[PDB]
Write a protein that binds this DNA or RNA. Structure first.
Ligand code: ZN
Length: 271
DNA sequence: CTCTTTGTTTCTCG
DNA sequence: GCGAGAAACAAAGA
């Protein structure tokens, strides 16, 4: 998932598990806990969930006063709230059990990660990752964004995917954003003019905020605790190879850019 | 049978 | 430093 989908999951967990005492924690795949599973089990059993935050595509569980569990879902990670008697599913890896149910993490590809760190280590953790600003008008400063684009010869799509110019875009929303802002994904960033940078800046904020309002995009695998998003119905290019651009009627094309499948209108997004 | 594709991140190689 | 390619892993389609 990308930022919109992670935020939707964050909001649903906030509503449902805040205030819950963790009775026990179990793993069938303890190796995805990067800080040590038996260590996490010992520290968190008997603690109460106080909050759930997010930074970029990362979930942050706030547990007791001084623990933060940082969870990344990578490509296929999924959480569900289940009854205590729910049967195991094939790709279930970890569970936190409460009095009235359990929070299960599943990940077919085993890419997702958990890391237990202290409250005062959360800010340093994300500085070390080099995560850029959240995609909001208040945090995403167009002036610094412009200056960074000016000095680079990186192609715009790969650069945006790095999470360093702005946090939260992945393959779906980077494609949607570039189509909205009429920029070709292979455009070298130092070639972008000020007015194009301004439309790109605003289009990143607008599309992600729309995706969040609509509960994310459900394409193949995504749902927020069993709830389908509605953003998939608004996609203009991603997965739309061979269909006609809603603006000009040209056929959406798909190419490969830096290892990634890339969907664009060849008329609206001039090379 | 092989080869390609997939909502992420982070490594090696030259 | 960089870009290209690939690994971590599983499943599905051609
Ligand atoms: Zn078009």
């Amino acid at each position: 998932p990308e930022l919109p989908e992670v935020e939707t999951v964050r909001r649903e967990l906030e509503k449902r598990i805040v205030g819950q005492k963790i009775i026990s924690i179990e793993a069938t795949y303890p190796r995805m806990v990067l800080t040590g599973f038996e260590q996490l089990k010992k520290e968190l059993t008997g603690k109460t969930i106080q909050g759930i935050s997010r930074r970029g595509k990362y979930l942050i569980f706030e547990i007791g006063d001084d623990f933060r569990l940082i969870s990344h879902l990578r490509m296929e990670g999924k959480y569900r709230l289940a009854t205590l008697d729910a049967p195991r599913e094939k790709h279930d890896h970890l569970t936190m059990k409460f009095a009235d149910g359990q929070l299960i993490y599943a990940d077919v590809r085993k890419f997702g990660t958990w890391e237990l760190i202290s409250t005062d280590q959360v800010l340093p953790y994300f500085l070390k990752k080099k995560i850029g600003p959240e995609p909001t008008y208040e945090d995403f400063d167009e002036k610094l964004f412009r200056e960074k684009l000016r000095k680079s010869t990186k192609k715009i799509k790969p650069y945006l995917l790095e999470q360093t110019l702005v946090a939260g875009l992945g393959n779906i929303y980077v494609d949607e954003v570039l189509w909205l802002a009429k920029i070709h994904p292979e455009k070298e960033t130092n070639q972008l003019i000020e007015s194009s940078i301004h439309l790109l800046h605003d289009s990143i904020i607008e599309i992600l905020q729309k995706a969040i309002k609509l509960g994310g995009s459900s394409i193949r695998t995504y749902s927020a605790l069993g709830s389908t998003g509605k953003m998939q119905n608004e996609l203009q290019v991603y997965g739309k190879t061979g269909e006609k651009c809603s603006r000009c009627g040209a056929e959406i094309q798909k190419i490969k850019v830096a290892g990634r499948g890339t969907h664009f209108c060849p008329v609206c997004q001039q090379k």
